[PDB]
Design an enzyme around this catalytic site. Structure first.
Site, short mmCIF file in Angstrom:
data_model
loop_
_atom_site.label_atom_id
_atom_site.label_comp_id
_atom_site.label_asym_id
_atom_site.label_seq_id
_atom_site.Cartn_x
_atom_site.Cartn_y
_atom_site.Cartn_z
N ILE A 71 3.02 56.95 64.89
CA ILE A 71 3.67 58.17 65.31
C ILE A 71 5.18 58.10 65.38
O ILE A 71 5.83 59.07 65.78
CB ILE A 71 3.07 58.66 66.65
N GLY A 72 5.74 56.96 64.96
CA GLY A 72 7.18 56.81 64.97
C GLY A 72 7.68 55.38 64.91
O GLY A 72 6.98 54.43 65.26
N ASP A 121 6.71 65.17 70.08
CA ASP A 121 8.07 64.78 70.47
C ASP A 121 9.00 65.93 70.16
O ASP A 121 8.66 66.83 69.39
CB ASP A 121 8.55 63.47 69.81
N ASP A 125 19.45 54.89 74.68
CA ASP A 125 19.20 55.32 73.30
C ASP A 125 18.42 56.62 73.25
O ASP A 125 17.43 56.75 72.52
CB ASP A 125 18.42 54.24 72.55
N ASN A 176 12.66 60.40 71.33
CA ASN A 176 12.32 59.72 72.57
C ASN A 176 12.03 60.68 73.71
O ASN A 176 11.88 60.25 74.86
CB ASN A 176 13.45 58.78 73.01
#
Ligand SMILES: COc1ccc2c(c1)/C(=C/c1cnc[nH]1)C(=O)N2
EC number: 2.7.11.22
Length: 294
Positions: free
Chosen positions: A10-11, A82, A123, A128
């Site tokens: 997923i990332g 996200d 970050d 995120n």
């Protein structure tokens, strides 16, 4: 990995790849981050473990931190989508202002919480930030830079996103402060409003100069000490600050004033998450439900 079934990746984050996975034993659906190693700094492992105790409605829950076979796995709760995917999906119509306001307010609550516990994210970026069908949004994948070090070349040669990096990091400051998270969040807020990244640099100097071209090249007047920063060069072009009404036009004045305070050059003048929660922009905040296509 025998404990899980990788439904789908997923990332890929600057520190590793994350997969949606199912615990064959309990059937629980989670997000598993696998960290790219030799011995694996047990010092980080301890600090990361500390993060398991963070309990906040706006912080993605870290369930477990396992060191085994030259690899470090982080098991997280799984959220629906996200923010990057949601913004892309909302590109034609735009995210409703009441929902943008709700998300920004919740993100600041989450940051106010971690910052009061002396935890920095370092970050923050749309990938995120995770959302669910109930209207909540949460911060994911803290620390790492605190336990490890500022990345540069992922094990996969991933194109590290610089778009949300605070100017003090770009200028080589050695001691980050909580203000770097406020800067990143400010950049994200602008992006939700305009539907375009605010400072889409493709290199560190391009990132820095895009910031300077919009907000003006900083000097000792607006940022005491800037000319003595590690990577500051007297040869940097001197751009005058652009009128701010051009930055995020769909935004009313309360929104623009708050954003301007989140983007102050001087980390000491940049608004705190706690002070931001008290800003007039949130006087009429509500909690709308997003239209999510899963
Ligand atoms: C960046 O690090 C993380 C950490 C925990 C996570 C996700 C990502 C994550 C991402 C995601 C992307 N689309 C749905 N979920 C999730 O559900 N839990």
């Amino acid at each position: 990995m025998e404990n899980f079934q990788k439904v789908e990746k997923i990332g890929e984050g600057t520190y590793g790849v994350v997969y949606k996975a199912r615990n064959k034993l309990t059937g629980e659906v989670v997000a598993l981050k696998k960290i790219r190693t030799e011995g694996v700094p047990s010092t980080a492992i301890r600090e990361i473990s500390l993060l398991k105790e963070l309990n906040h409605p706006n912080i993605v829950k870290l369930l477990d931190v396992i060191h085994t076979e030259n690899k470090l796995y982080l098991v997280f709760e799984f959220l629906h989508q996200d923010l990057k995917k949601f913004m892309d999906a909302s590109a034609l119509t735009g995210i409703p202002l009441p929902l943008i306001k709700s998300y920004l307010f919740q993100l600041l609550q989450g940051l106010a919480f971690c910052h009061s516990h002396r935890v920095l994210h370092r970050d923050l970026k749309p990938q995120n930030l995770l959302i669910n069908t109930e209207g909540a949004i949460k911060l994911a994948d803290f620390g790492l830079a605190r336990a490890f070090g500022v990345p540069v070349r992922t094990y996969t040669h991933e194109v590290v996103t610089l778009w949300y990096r605070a100017p003090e990091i770009l200028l080589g400051c050695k001691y980050y402060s909580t203000a770097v998270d406020i800067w990143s969040l400010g950049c994200i807020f602008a992006e939700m409003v305009t539907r375009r990244a605010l400072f889409p640099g493709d290199s560190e100097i391009d990132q820095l100069f895009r910031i300077f071209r919009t907000l003006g090249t900083p000097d000792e007047v607006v940022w005491p000490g800037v000319t003595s920063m590690p990577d500051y060069k007297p040869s940097f072009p001197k751009w005058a600050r652009q009128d701010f009404s051009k930055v995020v036009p769909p935004l009313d004045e309360d929104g623009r004033s708050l954003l301007s305070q989140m983007l102050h050059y001087d980390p000491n003048k940049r608004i705190s998450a706690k002070a931001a929660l008290a800003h007039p922009f949130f006087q009429d905040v509500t909690k709308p439900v997003p239209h999510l296509r899963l």
